[model samples]
Structure formats: C-alpha cells, structure tokens
Target: ENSLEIEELARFAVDEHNKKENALLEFVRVVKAKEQIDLTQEWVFTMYYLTLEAKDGGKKKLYEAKVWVKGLTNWKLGMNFKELQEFKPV
Candidate 1:
C-alpha cells in the first residue's frame, strides 16, 4: 500500500472541496480508502473512495469522496476529478 500517494489524494479532496463550498475544511488524514487500478485502457487509471477525517468549524467531521486519477503519472493536481458526500456536522 502507498501511504504517500493515497494521502495526497485525500488532502487533495479536502482542498478541492473547500474551493467550491467556501467551507474551511482542514484536512486531517485519510480514514479509509477503496481504490481500483484500471490497466485495460491506454494508460493506468486510479479510482478511490476516500474517507477523510477533518475539522468543520470545531468538531471533527468526515467526508467520503470519489477521486479518480484518470491517467497514470499525471502529476498535475488539477488533472483529476472528485465527487464528495458530506456527513453530519456539529
């Protein structure tokens, strides 16, 4: 398992989320992730269901995000896409 790449995507998820909702979601770390590697295409692709823990206003909150790296070695952060689901907030 890759601790580096996985977490990078996790943090990336939170950061991307903040830009859209204008909510200051400080990223903590990835709680869990389900990832798939697709090699059938012209390039390797990675898709992740990322469960990330973070702080919302004051209390700890979590977000499950769908992050997909559509192409391999695609170093640019903006090259990917995300779909996030919000959880309970206090």
Candidate 2:
C-alpha cells in the first residue's frame, strides 16, 4: 500500500490550497476586483502579511487574513525588497 506517499501528497495538497497566493488569486477572481488596491505589508517573523483591504461590513482591528496566510502566502512574510529576487509562478 502507498499509504505514506498518499499521506504526504494529501498534506502537500492541503498546504498548497491554504497558501496565501492561491487564496488572494481566488478571491480576486471571484470578486472581479479592480487592479488597484492597497495592502498593509508587514513582517513579524518567518512570514509576510499582505493585509487585504477591509470588505464592506468588515471591521477594522481584525488582522485575521494576515495571520491566517503566514508562511503559505506567496508574499514571504518578512521579505525585504532586495530579497524579492525569489521566483514567482507567473
């Protein structure tokens, strides 16, 4: 049985699904959002925070998106401009 391989594959799939880039792209695609938007770029540790603007009816003081997307997001949580040399999937 390929139980171990299957488990690893499942874990990887979940990780990718929950990644930041995937989530942002999916949300944008769904909302048909305009090109221009502002986000608070912050870094605390081994992750980057791409804080999407608050939605209608959404309140401030909630940093849930940033906390949720931590390492899995395409925007590395704490990347300086110089370190942005990392390749992205265009």
Candidate 3:
C-alpha cells in the first residue's frame, strides 16, 4: 500500500530529474522511513547514478530526494525551500 506509493513518488522524481540533463538515475532505494506532514506523507529515496566515470569512477554518486504523496496515484515532487519553510510541522 504505502510502500508502493512511496516507490511511485521516487520514480516520479527520477522522471523529473532526467528531463533536465544528460544524467540518468540508475537506481532508487528507499530508506525505510516516512514523515507525516499536515495530511500528506513524505518519503525519502536515495538515487544512484553514473557520471564522469573516467574522472570519478571510484567515487560513489547519489542524490537524496523527498517526495510528497497524497494518495495511491497522486504523487508530486517535494516542495521547494520556501514551501518547506512555510510548511507547519505537525
């Protein structure tokens, strides 16, 4: 239930990320944690990638992203800095 939704949100972030540059998200792993905000849920995902391999092969590359989801199929990227600051903790 919630687990699947969390993955969907993670995939959504990867989709958005690929739209911007040559990098690709090779993998996404969940941290097995969740945070509740107002009435929605936030999920954290660690993204794996490969870039500048020759110059940075041995260096591990990853990005952490937080996504907000409201329902089974209703998911969106996490809020920006401003929205995050405005979000009241609950």
Best by TM-score: 1
Model 2 CA deviation exceeding 4 Å by range: 20-90
- Model 3 stretches astray by more than 4 angstroms: 39-61, 68-90
Give RMSD to native, each candidate: 4.1, 15.1, 10.2
**Order of models, best TM-score first:** 1, 3, 2
Q: Could you give candidate 3's per-residue lDDT for residues 34-69 as a string of tens digits?
A: 544443326433322111111123444444554443
Question: Per-residue CA lDDT of candidate 2, range 1-90, in tens?
Answer: 334422332333223434634542221111111112234556422222222222223432212121122333334344122111121221
18-90 in candidate 1: lDDT tens per residue?
8878888998878888877788877666677778899888868877887767554345445434334443332
Candidate 1: segments with Cα more than 4 A from true spot:
39-44, 73-90
Alpha-carbon lDDT of model 1: 0.71
Q: Pairing residues by index, what is the TM-score of model 1?
A: 0.71
Cα lDDT, all candidates = 0.71, 0.27, 0.39
Residue 20 deviation, candidate 2, in Å?
4.5
TM-scores of all predicted structures: 0.71, 0.22, 0.44
